[PDB]
Write a protein that binds this ligand. Sequence first.
Ligand code: HEM
Ligand code: HEM
Ligand code: 3XB
Ligand code: 3XB
Ligand code: H4B
Ligand code: H4B
Ligand code: ZN
Lengths: 405, 403
Amino acid sequence: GPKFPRVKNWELGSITYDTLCAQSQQDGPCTPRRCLGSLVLPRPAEQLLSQARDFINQYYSSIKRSGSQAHEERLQEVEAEVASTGTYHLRESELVFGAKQAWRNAPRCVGRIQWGKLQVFDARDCSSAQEMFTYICNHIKYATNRGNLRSAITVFPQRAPGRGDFRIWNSQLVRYAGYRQQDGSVRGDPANVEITELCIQHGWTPGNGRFDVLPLLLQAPDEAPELFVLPPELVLEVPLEHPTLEWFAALGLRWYALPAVSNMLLEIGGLEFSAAPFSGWYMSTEIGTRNLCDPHRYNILEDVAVCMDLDTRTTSSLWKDKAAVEINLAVLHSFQLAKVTIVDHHAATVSFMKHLDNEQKARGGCPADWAWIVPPISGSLTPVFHQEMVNYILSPAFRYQPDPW
Amino acid sequence: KFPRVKNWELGSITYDTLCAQSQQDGPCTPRRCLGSLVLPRPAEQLLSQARDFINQYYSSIKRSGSQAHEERLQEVEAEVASTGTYHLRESELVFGAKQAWRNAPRCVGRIQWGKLQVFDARDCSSAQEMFTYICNHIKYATNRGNLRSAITVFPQRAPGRGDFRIWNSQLVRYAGYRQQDGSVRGDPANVEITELCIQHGWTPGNGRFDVLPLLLQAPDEAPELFVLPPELVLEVPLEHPTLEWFAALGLRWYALPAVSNMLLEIGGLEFSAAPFSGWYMSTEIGTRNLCDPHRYNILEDVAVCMDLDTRTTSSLWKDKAAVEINLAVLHSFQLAKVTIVDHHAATVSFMKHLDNEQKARGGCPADWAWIVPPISGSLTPVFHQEMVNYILSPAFRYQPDPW
Ligand code: HEM
Ligand code: HEM
Ligand SMILES: Cc1cc(N)nc(C[C@@H]2CNC[C@@H]2OCCNCC(F)(F)c2cccc(F)c2)c1
Ligand SMILES: Cc1cc(N)nc(C[C@@H]2CNC[C@@H]2OCCNCC(F)(F)c2cccc(F)c2)c1
Ligand SMILES: C[C@H](O)[C@H](O)[C@H]1CNc2nc(N)[nH]c(=O)c2N1
Ligand SMILES: C[C@H](O)[C@H](O)[C@H]1CNc2nc(N)[nH]c(=O)c2N1
Ligand SMILES: [Zn+2]
């Protein structure tokens, strides 16, 4: 082998070299002195043009037209535009290509075997917060497809010089309210306290439940954000029940069908889309393990263990483990019952192995964040645990961005 | 320069300043992270690693800058200047071994770092003598079930000649025997070492749990074969709290986790045979050893016994059976009165260790993928704790198989 990362699968004994990483144009947070790979957050003119050039090259390569008349004219067209305005504009098919490429390039998504199937909705004509609401509601209608979920992304207008951003304030399109109490405890989802408080300040009359759907705070450039309420018929939800444990349904737990991230930046060839929400379908463990068992979230492990009649007095009864399995199973069982798309952590990780194999043949590598790809239960029971991965930033990219308040 | 380390369960924040004392480079660059890779791939150098360690020593017994410090530093110059190398005093080696454990980023058990019986075997000259030493280490460390962490330090490396080595990866391992049907009986990880044993003339059992012999190598000698007296090797029959059938699986594990193939570096000196042992954390046996597909791979057998649905993965039979096997192990070890710690207790103590280290040193090098357990990851507080990883010395390094 050569001076590219050597990558081993310890279950199978198979070796690959990552040559794609050579493509990376942006430094991550690690150095030879220290690995910072487990931090969740780390941290004009020529600079723009070069990025733009790189993306157009990428576009043209993908349509197999590298070096050609139209390829070189488009380059000259992009330069022209940046020369007289300082920015430029993607073509319809260039946006489609990029959006998909950003999903392909996201090191933290286990669901990338699906990268090539993605409805790109162009909303770069959107002009008001009201119009955003509309656009967002069409997205939710399309993507939900009555439970037969379909991956999509709606792209609003790119950042402009000295001009405000289009922003969705909500971290996801569909999230539950969290209400701070007299006790100090939270009723609802403790992640969402702040945004809940922001909505009430902007005129929302709040509910008082564990599962109230948040309204949307949407922001057209240079105005303050307007508040929009999703019609309940538009938000599909799955009441939670267990297959064998009959009491589970009595807990009154539930989750929403559509996982739609809404607070991420989509950066394509230097252009920045501050508002471009995307959505797919859940992996069982996101709801069952993270949302419902995290001590700083709904934290239902104790409750369920008690119902199950486990010894919660001692760690070694593996009461946390026993309960978490049933919650997870209750998630899957119930989504399946309601005929709403879900994938379990086994099935998912199997298919990402397949994605890894594809991307090896196609690009010679696949950036991947191990701690994020490996599921929060039953880790080494899934094939990804035994797979070494290389993490690196590629572009187009989805980039986290700070809350707008 | 100083990285911010947040914990997302509680929202608390620290800064790691400890990582600045790292002198040895890891595998990451700013262009790409390789932190999930299991493996990497003259007087000035040695003399400055040695001073820096002696500094670490006198500083640790508060005598930094005193007479005994100055003259010991000079004893080091003098020895390297004349011989190309030098030797450590017993107390120094004791300090360095504990520090090597402390510095081990992949060890979730570091709360215990200061409690370590150090056996000095540097006066070892034969594979015979090696064996006795190893046999004493086992008797000490096992202590009829009341496990005591220990290390034994064989003679250092030397430019003149070959290394003292223990060919085995652990002092106690189960043999893996390749069958005709291209199948493995026993432990598939130990196929190659089992074939080495047999080649150096061992008579093999044909059970699923046959304790391998030791292959011990003195400098520039053919390794020698030594059978462990069966009474030294404490084993644990596996049974289940509620499932009476489990015991009839005939499953079992050994008490003592004792790594023997890792090189111990202190002050630039290299100890190529320095086995060490503590006690197990249950997921090691229950999850990895027994349910890994390239190991004993018993998940399906056990789930079928549990009468679950193998046909589809959304019934979570892998997870369900995985838990019972971990349960069986805990129960069994607690029943046989043998130290073991579950992943919840251990990760809780690791958090506290992170706290103590923060106050004492300004951080703790940690490797997230190894600290987080292989089941119920996010169920443990380590999952939500950011972690910085970097190499401090004294350290344990991984080493090439001697063959
Ligand atoms: C198609 C079904 C999909 C599944 C099953 C899936 C699965 C996942 C999972 C389990 C995570 C870990 C997130 C967490 O625990 O917070 C993740 C992250 C991510 N996914 Fe997906 N994903 C899917 C589709 C998509 C789509 C359509 C996009 C956008 C085109 C996308 C882009 C991302 C990004 C950017 C992350 C990192 C998120 C962050 O850093 O906050 N994924 N995915
Ligand atoms: C006191 C009981 C101990 C517990 C519960 C414990 C726990 C663990 C665990 C779970 C691992 C990862 C194991 C794996 O999945 O391969 C590990 C790794 C390690 N531990 Fe410990 N440990 C203990 C004692 C020790 C001792 C006594 C030493 C030596 C002084 C030590 C030094 C190391 C080193 C160097 C590694 C890296 C493993 C490797 O690179 O293969 N630990 N520890
Ligand atoms: C603080 C911070 C930084 C960052 N980069 N990222 C986050 C999202 C956090 C991470 N962990 C939980 C939460 O993110 C919740 C959303 N995660 C992904 C998902 F569930 F919404 C999803 C699932 C399938 C498909 C899809 F398109 C989206 C937070
Ligand atoms: C190839 C390779 C590289 C490397 N760095 N390391 C290895 C040891 C492997 C890793 N994964 C399992 C196996 O190592 C055997 C077990 N490792 C730790 C332990 F079990 F030995 C242990 C537990 C508690 C206390 C204690 F002292 C020791 C292999
Ligand atoms: C500190 C650690 O990186 C953090 O808890 C991460 C670990 N892995 C994760 N993996 C996924 N998919 N989602 C997460 O939120 C996290 N949290
Ligand atoms: C490829 C991956 O890094 C490898 O499987 C690691 C992951 N985490 C681990 N963690 C521990 N404690 N022990 C291990 O052997 C491993 N294996
Ligand atoms: Zn790294």
